Structures are given as structure tokens and as C-alpha cells.
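Complex record, three chains
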Amino acid sequence: FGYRDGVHTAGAMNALLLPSGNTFIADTYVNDEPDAEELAEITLMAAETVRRFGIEPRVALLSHSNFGSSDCPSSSKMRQALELVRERAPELMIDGEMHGDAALVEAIRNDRMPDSSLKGSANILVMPNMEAARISYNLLRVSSSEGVTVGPVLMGVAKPVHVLTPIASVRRIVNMVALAVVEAQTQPL
Amino acid sequence: PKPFDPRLIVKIAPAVAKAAMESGVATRPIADFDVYIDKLTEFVYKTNLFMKPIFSQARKAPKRVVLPEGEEARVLHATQELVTLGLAKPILIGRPNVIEMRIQKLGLQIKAGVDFEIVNNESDPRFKEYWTEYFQIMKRRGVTQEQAQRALISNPTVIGAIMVQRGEADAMICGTVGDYHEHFSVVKNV
Amino acid sequence: PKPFDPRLIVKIAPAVAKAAMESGVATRPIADFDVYIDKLTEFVYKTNLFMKPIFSQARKAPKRVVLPEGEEARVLHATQELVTLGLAKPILIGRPNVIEMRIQKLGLQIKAGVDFEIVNNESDPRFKEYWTEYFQIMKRRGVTQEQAQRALISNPTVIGAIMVQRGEADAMICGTVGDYHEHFSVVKNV
């Protein structure tokens, strides 16, 4: 198929149901160590996919650094990705980089950064590498006592296709068939 | 005066020269005494010949300079010599009691509030604005509000940099105690 | 007492149970009250069930612990609760006036010099030995003698680490204000 026009990367995104609501995690399956540009493109595609669900996207970039408390290369990569995203789509609600609890809890974020541009609890989480994304996704999947997901949604390819996992149940297959049909209804971009 | 006082030549020689001037025993009269005193000083201090344009330009319009390390003896001596030369308007940072006691101990003559200003770092009325501005600058570099307050209490260099940034001073001279790169990092960040 | 006081269950329920014990209306007598109070506490605090072996082992022989950050309200509350449980012998670092005034403000009952020791960082008789030892440790890591004295005056974590190293304490708990890695660096170096 190849990439859709205007994009040079692909990503995977998993849905999950936490006490704070529905939440998406990217990227979990494709890129082993994305750079800033790939992170920006993944963020934009994830925002569009979330918009499909009739939800107002809210993005958070996660790291062990908390608003510049560290200067390891990963945190710098997040800062560059954030500036790129703000350059491209100015109307998107996004902030970072921050800790996970700050992203999920309003009071913690407001204590440390009273004037953040992100309101409420984020519903899209972008990780620096596939290690963190996969580990967090699995641990949260088991610990959030439901154990149900909607993933992996694949974004970036020029045709409406998705790739599942061998442990996928019937309901997940039905959900992805419906989602692919919805994507294919409009003329592919 | 003690034998090794360096001001002896500068205070004596022009007076004797003027006494020669009045009594008519001189044979090679000097034009003006200012260049004479300058030459004597260049003999004394070995860098006046190099720094003379700087001193001449600076004496035309003094500015406000912050010395965060306002309890060192060297800084106090420098403040006295700066006031005497009429070359700047110093501002010191530290506890007023220690500064006054050491001024008495060293036998200087500069008087707090008349020749220079003392900023009490432990208790200042502008603490709120200072730490608020520091946080507004450094929030994305990993500085929480409590860290900002602690820094504005404990770090004189930060106080000096914030004072210069807001326009309450004009220059800062720091770093006579401690490592170079911590001061440089603070200055570059602010 | 206020309605939300958590000690209410622990103080009330065993007393009512013992009253039932005396009057003979009980039908399922309890063996000993200690496990009962423990179970109630595990209901209250949600981590006693996990930490019970640690508490039981620690209560057999208390040691000496240094809390360098001896002016925070949380540290004072923790000191009170540690003294009450008979679980350690705390040592606090800070200015005695502020510590006493805040103890009065919070309405605690621990008394300085009887339940815990206060080390006045600004003026201590063992300042010389402490900064000498710190310099002897850190001279090859770029720490001059003046830096050592300044650190032993201004940094409570260094004072605590030196106190532990010399054997005047047994453990240290620090880092409730400021960044993690500065405290960790000091601890690792010492």
C-alpha cells in the first residue's frame, strides 16, 4: 500500500478504559525508537482518529522528566516534538512533557504548572519508545480490572487496513471490522 | 600612616611639586596636576596605563552595579575604592548586621544607605515578585514554585540576576566564591 | 474531638469490647486486645497489614535517625507519631526558635531535649570537625576548604550524612524538599 500522502511514518494506538475515562496510548507496535518528527506525525494522526470517535482530543507527552526537570536526550526529543506539533496544528490541545499522574490528574498538574494549556484529564498519551508504551499498556490492561481494549488501530497507511494479535477475541475483531468500514466509507485520504 | 601605604606617593609628591611651584625654585613647570597624578598612579598599580580609557569613559556617567557577595572583605574594600573614585553606585546583598560589623572591623568609611544600598536577602519586601518572576522564567526547566522560593532565599546570584533583569540595577559582578560554572549557568538561564 | 479524627475507632471500640467482656453479655470472647487493635489500625491506614513485620522488628530495638529537614510540618507530625509508637529516637536539624514556635502552633506534645534532639546548624560546637571531615573526603572532587565550611553551614543533608558517617547517628531520612538527585549525589559521595 505505502504511506498516505504527506506522511512518512506509521503508528499503532491502543484504547483502554481507566477510572478517568477512555484513553489512547501510542505508539505501541510499529516504531522502536521514534524521533521528534515521527512523534509529531503520530500525534496528528492519533488526534484525527480520536476525532472519529466523537471525542475532543487532548494530548499529553510523557517522560520521566517533569517540565524540563531533566535534560536526557529523550526529554529534548519530546520538547522538539511539542514545538513541532504546536507549529503545525495550532488549535490542538496539547502540553508536555510531564509525568503520568500530572497528565491524568487535574490537581497535580495545576499545583506544578498553573497555566498549562491542557484542561481536564488527557485522553491521548504519547510515549518516547515502544518499551514504555508496551509495558504501560499491558500492565494497565491487567490492572484496570476489565482487561478489555480496542487495539491496535493502525494509522499512516494509504488504505483502511488493521493488524490484530493472535490473542484477539471475537468482540475485538467485530470492533475493528466496524472501524475499518467507517474509515473506508469516506474517500481514503 | 604605616610605612607600606601605597597612597603616600600620590598624596605627597604633588604637594611638594606645588610648593616648588609657589616659591619659584622650579625650572620645568608642569602644565596640570591631573596627568601627573595619573602617571604616579600608573607607577603604583601597573594597570592604570592599560585601563585609563575605561576609567575615563566610566567616570562620565556612573551606573548601578550589584555585588551579590556583599560580606567578603575584598568586596567591601572594592566598594570603598569605587565610592572614592566616584566610579559606580554599588548595591550589596547580605545581612546588614554582619556587613556593618565588618565595616567597623576593617575601619572603612562608607556608610550604608548613603554611599551604597543593602538588600536583606533573608527578608525583603519584594520577595514575592522576585520569586514569581524566577518561576515564570524557569518553570519549563524543572523548577517548582517551592524551589523558586528556596532559591530566592538562599542564592544571592539569582537575586542579583533578577534585580538586573527587572531594571532595578544596571550590571552585576559575581563569582568571587564558589565554582565558575554554577554562576555562569544561572546567568545564562536568566 | 473533631468528627474526622482517625483515632476514634481505635480508642473507642476496644473499650466497648472490654465493657462487654466485664458484664458477661459477650458471646464470642476475644483472646487478646493487641491483635484487635492491630486489625482496626489496618482498617484505618491501609498499609499496616503490609508493614507489620517491619514495625514489629523495629520496635524491638530503636535506633537513632536524622531528619535534616526539621522545620517542615510533615516532619514534625512524623516525629510526633514516631515518638508515640516508640519506634525511633529522632534528631532534627534547624533553628530551635522556629521549631519550638511551630510545635506550639501545631499543638503537638513532643518536648525538645526529652523526646528528640535539636542540632542548631547555624552554630554548633562540632562545626570544625564536621567541615574538616567533609573536606578530607571531598578534596579530590573539587571542594575547597571555604566551600566545605559554606556547605556545612548551609546544607542540612551534608550535616546529616557527616553525622551518620562519624557514628553519632544510625540512619538518615532526607529529601522532602528539593530535587532528588542533589540529595542522592551528596549521599553517594559521602
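Note: The interface with chain B takes residues 142, 146-147, 150, 154, 177-179 of chain C (CB under 8 Å).
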